[PDB]
Amino acid sequence: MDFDAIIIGAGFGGLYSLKKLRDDFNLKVRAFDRATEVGGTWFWNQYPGALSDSETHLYCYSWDKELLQEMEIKRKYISQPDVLAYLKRVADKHDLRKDIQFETGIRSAYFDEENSFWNVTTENDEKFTARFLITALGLLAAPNLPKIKGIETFKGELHHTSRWPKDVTFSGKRVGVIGTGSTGVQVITAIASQVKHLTVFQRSAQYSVPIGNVVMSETDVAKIKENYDQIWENVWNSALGYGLNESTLPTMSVSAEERDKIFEKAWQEGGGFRFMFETFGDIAVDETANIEAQNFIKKKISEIVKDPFVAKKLTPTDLYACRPLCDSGYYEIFNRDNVSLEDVKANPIVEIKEDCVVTADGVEHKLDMLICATGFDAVDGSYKRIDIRGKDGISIKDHWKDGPNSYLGMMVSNFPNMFMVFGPNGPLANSPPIIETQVRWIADLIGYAEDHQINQIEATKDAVDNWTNTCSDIANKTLFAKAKCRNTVYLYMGGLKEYRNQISEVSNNNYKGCLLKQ
């Protein structure tokens, strides 16, 4: 009797969840977040070089036409402080904070089968009740780097990229970075010119393409805002929602000289998804096609990195091109006299002293600062860190013991009245379009519940297994069977448009696979 819905999360997913349910469906709803301000991961992740993978004019909401026309499009891609300022504007305009309880982590969510609602308890023993639970948790857990003996003995600055403190200075300091993923590449490229010396501890070299983050002219921004309606229709009609001309052309169907200029054109425009999916249509499907994309980036590495032994060290061994990163000058950094690259697969880290990282060759790497760009736990980690218990009292820890399974990426069997926003078993595409799709869909169902006097919604065990069927069927058709994440399937790989088709069919067929109770 407290609320119609409780929302966990104050980022992209939770913000739109609260706006949709409160202002478009007149529900009484409260949102909770451990943060002190809106933003989600854009409020937490403030490491150097933090940048969006998707272009500025698309990494935003589409449901507010006035916001689209007044939005600031400063550069082709948007930095973390600017995303945070955008989400704070969204909360300002739509009067959202008055229904968000900040500095409040939820500890447990217990489904009350008798009354058909959720018992939600914060970490300060505050207990709320609500008919529906909206979980917009994102992806977060941060595996710091234990496994390395003696990391707790380090006397210098030790930061994980997810907990990046304020007022970090780099001048005159010897800095080390562990991790060469998307975050590591961004930090390394941003700080190398600022430090006295940078040591990169690379376990696995990955492919990276230029992002081409350039300033946007008054004319560039005007052409976007004049054609914004068509731009978003292309997003809903695409597989990735990145504004790309998604290619159908086979990689080997063109000559070697034509293939080189197609890759070169995308290399100049910039963009990771552009290089994989705007160039040709079978790079993630055919091995001969994939190797062609590998050899182009491998050739680009050996031209940029003048030292052939450093270039060889940066070249991915046998890793096939599956999600290459984007960078703003990552390969050029290793030409600097103050940058050292350490292959910690052939020369592993064995211990950390009070003042250094020591490798297996005995070399002590003196450091004033050690940055851990080591990553984040699995996508179900944010859910397992919650004490959620549905029917018969089973917890999501037990139910997802062997990975996350769901119906349409939004519903979990044995967990009624719980709807996941940007959760696992979802599509691989631009996140704001995915979040908007799922939030509009979930709100449509809850409105269908208030109209039809329904107080319990639950997915069946077989609709979930049917979802695992279509995800595994599409996934096993693509090259994503070597170094990724994902018989539990983690992602639906049919694209955004087919995901919206799939989810529209069951909303048009009386929510097939859902157990509606009155």
Ligand SMILES: Cc1cc2nc3c(=O)[nH]c(=O)nc-3n(C[C@H](O)[C@H](O)[C@H](O)COP(=O)(O)OP(=O)(O)OC[C@H]3O[C@@H](n4cnc5c(N)ncnc54)[C@H](O)[C@@H]3O)c2cc1C
């Ligand atoms: C630097 C960066 C750049 C990215 N760029 C792109 C891009 O270009 N394109 C793209 O498609 N994706 C991108 N992503 C990924 C994706 O867009 C983000 O994960 C996205 O912000 C997800 O939004 P969200 O609201 O669902 O989750 P989040 O933004 O992570 O918000 C989740 C919130 O829930 C809160 N929360 C969780 N559990 C609890 C609890 N128990 N109690 C209280 N609060 C809780 C957290 O504190 C957090 O504030 C990027 C991610 C990062 C980190």
Ligand SMILES: NC(=O)C1=CN([C@@H]2O[C@H](COP(=O)(O)OP(=O)(O)OC[C@H]3O[C@@H](n4cnc5c(N)ncnc54)[C@H](OP(=O)(O)O)[C@@H]3O)[C@@H](O)[C@H]2O)C=CC1
């Ligand atoms: N817009 C963007 O481009 C961004 C996207 N993201 C998203 O966030 C997710 C996380 O990105 P990231 O933060 O890079 O997390 P990642 O897991 O992608 O990067 C992990 C890095 O840490 C290294 N590592 C982990 N453990 C060790 C160890 N014990 N010793 C040495 N090296 C180690 C890994 O090496 P190995 O590979 O050998 O395990 C890898 O290089 C990505 O999936 C990405 O999609 C986040 C920020 C920016």
